[PDB]
From a paper:
TCS are composed of two main players, a sensor protein called histidine kinase (HK) and an effector protein called [name] (RR). The HK catalytic core is comprised of an ATP-binding domain (CA domain) and a phosphoacceptor domain containing the phosphorylatable His residue (DHp domain). RR activity is controlled by the phosphorylation of a conserved Asp residue located at the N-terminal receiver domain (REC domain). Thus, we have explored the relation between the effect of the pH and His rotamer-dependent phosphorylation from a functional and structural perspective solving the structure of several [name]–[name] complexes at different pHs.
Additionally, we confirmed that the absence of the sulfate ion in HK853H260A was due to the loss of the His260 imidazole group by solving two additional structures comprising wild type [name] in complex with RR468D53A ([name]–RR468D53A) at pH 5.3 and 7. In these two structures, His260 presented a gauche− rotamer and was coordinating a sulfate ion in a similar position to that observed in the other complexes. Similarly, the sulfate ion was further stabilized by additional contacts with [name] R314 as well as with [name] K85 and D90. In these two structures, RR468D53A also showed the presence of the sulfate ion at the catalytic center in an identical position to the one observed in the HK853H260A–RR468D53A structures and so had acquired the phosphorylated conformation. However, the structures of [name]–[name] at varying pHs ranging from 5.3 to 7.5 shows an invariable gauche− rotamer for the catalytic His identical to the rotamer observed by Liu and collaborators at pH 5.0, demonstrating that pH is not driving the side-chain conformational switch. Oppositely, the structures support that the gauche− rotamer of His260 should represent an inactive resting state for the His awaiting to sense RR binding for phosphotransfer or P-RR for dephosphorylation, albeit independent of pH. In this resting conformation the phospho-His would be stabilized by a network of contacts with the phosphoryl group which are mimicked in our structures by a sulfate ion.
Residue numbers in the entry:
A (entry chain C), D (entry chain D): 2 to 121
B (entry chain A): 246 to 478
C (entry chain B): 246 to 479
Write the structure that this text describes.
């Protein structure tokens, strides 16, 4: 089955996204911040990254930048899921290599539709 | 205070309230669309998340309203005989869950024997303690194994002296004179992700000063902070 | 922005958000406490309320954020060719439930035949229409059998003229030149219970200004109001 | 069974309070504003009134005042259930003859406990 790296500083947020991903048979690996997410890429290669922006230690913009700078990391598709819904914030994220930006609050069903689209 | 801080304040309200709302909506929609895919314990767990996130949102609305009432000069205080040792322990218990989510240990010492009796409004002083305890958690170090917030209760100068000590990020010198102002937040690389309005310490200062007390701070950047609350006995 | 209005504004945020929050908490706790007694139909109904109330809360947070972005000048207009007849109808559909809860009929007329194209941002002009339609419902008469909000679409002066007309409480003359100000709300015995921040029309004005347009008002107290939005065609 | 007059401008709030009242076997009569509430006191006499403050046509403070004017209405216990949670708001409501003021947001279980106390 497909493997998703879920990167967000909220345990409550990770729980509900993980539940919806596991409804579709996907495996889920969690990271509490950007640095931990990049450390987890040494263990495995995910099929998709779900990434928040506002995290301690390393923010999502820094993560996106670091993903593009490493040969093996830059082709992993990333969906940014964030409360930072502004148009300049989206443009920056897309310019840093994110495939899609989705705003919080979000619809779990719409989120899973988009996860399916990128995984196929 | 100023108008640029008002705009930042309005944006900060939106973002702090958006986080619990995201959980409320995501959990509610998940339950609605997954009734056949939820066991009883998970259904109950997910409902509990909605309730607990609604309660945090409620507390954030109470902050806004208490601030407006303090600015209107409509917030009355009502004093009575209260044991502060029991009051502090109650506040410590109320924040343990939040402190655990950021790996912060919450401690309580008393330099004098308990009970420590004092003529105070119990709900408003609890609110002062909760604001200081919350800040100790919110502005704790990012990655450290020994993070704490400690309440030290003591009697001094014909009054009660409450110290809330932490080993968090600390506060720079130029900021120390402004942290008690309404809407003021330290804008740095160590606060960018921390939610807040800049009202907490403004509310705390006024509640303390309505009791005939004062509040001040000592802090070292990278070491931590000590907030001192003195109230007449 | 002035100090008395700012304090009033902060209190108004709390109260407007407290109403949907109250429903969310009461419905959620009721489900949790009554699982053994709730039938499936009612469980689903109660979850729908939580979701719908969360959506209203979300819209009120979007208002605060859009206002801050307009104040910072970071909010971006992206124009395209849009049919206004389709745009207005979509806005009318979006407000139907809220209008029904206050017994307000929502109408749509067009003096010009559809379609009517315009080079405009559809999301931002939708937001303008929703604010004016919301206000038409919020400030409708308290007890009347024939309450309405009507959107009238027309072409004029090398642009599109949208009129949002109501037969509501109306606006007094001293207030007419202040309603578009940030945080301004008419304080009277006909507005005390109506929730609001005073941001809606400030946002609407700004969005209209960014399109090279203007917004103005005509009103008579006790009769109703007409909000006029003029926007260039291309 | 005991009869409760439920006075609030929100249909959504009336629905959830009614559900919890009917769980305990109580009959529920609803009023969308203060004037309608007083109009319905002509057709019956409730054992409890649950009353909001911020309503169109007639607000809750005016209802409380008008309840004291008639000797028939003055004896009916009133629980104020309101978002107006300030101390001055509570004091006014209690001075106008309200037996209890409860704040919104509220716990339905705590609300029902207080309803039981006043009815018994
Ligand atoms: N214990 C603490 N350690 C470090 N900084 C603090 C602490 N408490 C408060 N501050 C600083 O003072 C500012 C104002 O605090 P407060 O008024 O509670 O507002 P908020 O927490 O919403 O930002 C904070 O933004 C933060 O920069
Ligand atoms: N259609 C209308 N009829 C009567 N008064 C209105 C109407 N629209 C707006 N107003 C008045 O203008 C004020 C500002 O409107 P707005 O900026 O939308 O803020 P809000 O609706 O949050 O108060 C309202 O408080 C109200 O007094």
């Amino acid at each position: 089955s497909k493997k998703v790296l879920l990167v967000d500083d909220s345990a409550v947020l990770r729980k509900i996204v993980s539940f919806n991903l596991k409804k579709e048979g996907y495996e889920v690996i969690e990271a509490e911040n950007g640095q931990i997410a990049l450390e987890k890429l040494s263990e495995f290669t995910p099929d998709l990254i779900v990434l928040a922006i506002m995290m301690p230690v390393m923010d999502g913009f820094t993560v996106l930048k670091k993903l593009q700078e490493k040969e093996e990391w830059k082709r992993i598709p990333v969906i940014v899921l964030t409360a930072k819904g502004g148009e300049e914030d989206e443009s920056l994220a897309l310019s840093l290599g994110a495939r899609k930006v989705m705003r919080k609050p979000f619809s779990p069903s719409q989120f899973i539709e988009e996860v399916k689209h990128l995984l196929n | 205070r100023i108008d640029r801080m008002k705009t930042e304040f309005i944006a900060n309200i939106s973002h702090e309230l958006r986080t619990p709302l995201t959980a409320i909506k995501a959990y509610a929609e998940t339950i609605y669309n997954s009734l056949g895919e939820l066991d009883l314990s998970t259904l109950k767990e997910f409902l509990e998340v909605i309730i607990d996130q609604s309660n945090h949102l409620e507390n954030l609305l109470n902050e806004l309203l208490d601030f407006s009432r303090l600015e209107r000069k409509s917030l009355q205080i009502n004093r009575e005989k209260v044991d502060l040792c029991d009051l502090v322990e109650s506040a410590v218990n109320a924040i343990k869950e939040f402190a655990s989510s950021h790996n912060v240990n919450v401690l309580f010492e008393s330099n004098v024997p308990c009970p420590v009796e004092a003529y105070i409004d119990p709900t408003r002083i609890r609110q002062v303690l909760l604001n200081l305890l919350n800040n100790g958690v919110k502005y704790s170090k990012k990655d450290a194994p020994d993070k704490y917030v400690k309440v030290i209760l003591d009697e001094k100068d014909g009054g009660v002296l409450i110290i809330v000590e932490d080993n968090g990020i600390g506060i720079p010198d130029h900021a120390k004179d402004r942290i008690f102002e309404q809407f003021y937040r330290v804008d740095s690389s160590l606060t960018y992700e921390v939610p807040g309005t800049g009202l907490g310490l403004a509310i705390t200062k006024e509640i303390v000063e309505l009791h005939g007390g004062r509040i001040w701070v000592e802090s070292e950047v990278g070491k931590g902070s000590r907030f001192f609350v003195w109230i007449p006995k």
